[PDB]
Amino acid sequence: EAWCVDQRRTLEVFKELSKINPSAILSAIYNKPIAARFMGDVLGLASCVTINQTSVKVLRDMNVKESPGRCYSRPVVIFNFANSSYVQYGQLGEDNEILLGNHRTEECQLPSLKIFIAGNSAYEYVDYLFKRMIDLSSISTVDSMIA
Amino acid sequence: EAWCVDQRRTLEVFKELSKINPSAILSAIYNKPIAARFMGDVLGLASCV
């Protein structure tokens, strides 16, 4: 009895964060990885295309030209579909999604320090400029399981 | 069985609100009061005075 109540209200947290990042909450429910886009009261589905993999390249400046103070919230990227060789400009979404035209930018606050994981390497950006590769295994990971 | 599933998806709500106010979600998990700052995909720790 008490169970379906944890269940019933924690539905309403799902509906809530769906309004923010529907990809995540939907995937969490149905377990599939599933991309999804927010639209109003009604959240549509959207399907993916896997690109060249190698190569994808991470550009070292996260400032936009022009101008300051307009800065990308995520590192910008150049990738290829394949078979093909048209060089495109995505923007490193999380969990290896490359972002078409919705460029998360986000206006220049100093001083920053964010680090972004793409594939299996972490890229530390100190002041919207790149600084160093970061050891992905150095970063301890929150285990949370109430067992 | 059904338990670890409330557990598994409500991990993904934690990861989500960590992106907003990591201090809170982290403290909620580990029970300590713990300050923390958002940085990218990777959320650093920070200590108080």
Binding site: I115, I117, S138, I139, S140, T141, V142, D143, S144, M145 | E1, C4, V5, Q7, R8, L11, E12, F14, K15, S18, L26, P33, A35, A36, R37, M39, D41, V42, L43, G44, L45, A46, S47, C48, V49
Partner: peptide
């Protein structure tokens, strides 16, 4: 308890990340 604090990141380390680490 919850004193009047000011919190910052001292050294470079240390950082925690999330990942999908529980599997049913």
């Amino acid at each position: 308890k919850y004193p009047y604090r000011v919190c910052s990141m001292a050294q470079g380390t240390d950082l925690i990340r999330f990942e999908r680490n529980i599997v049913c």
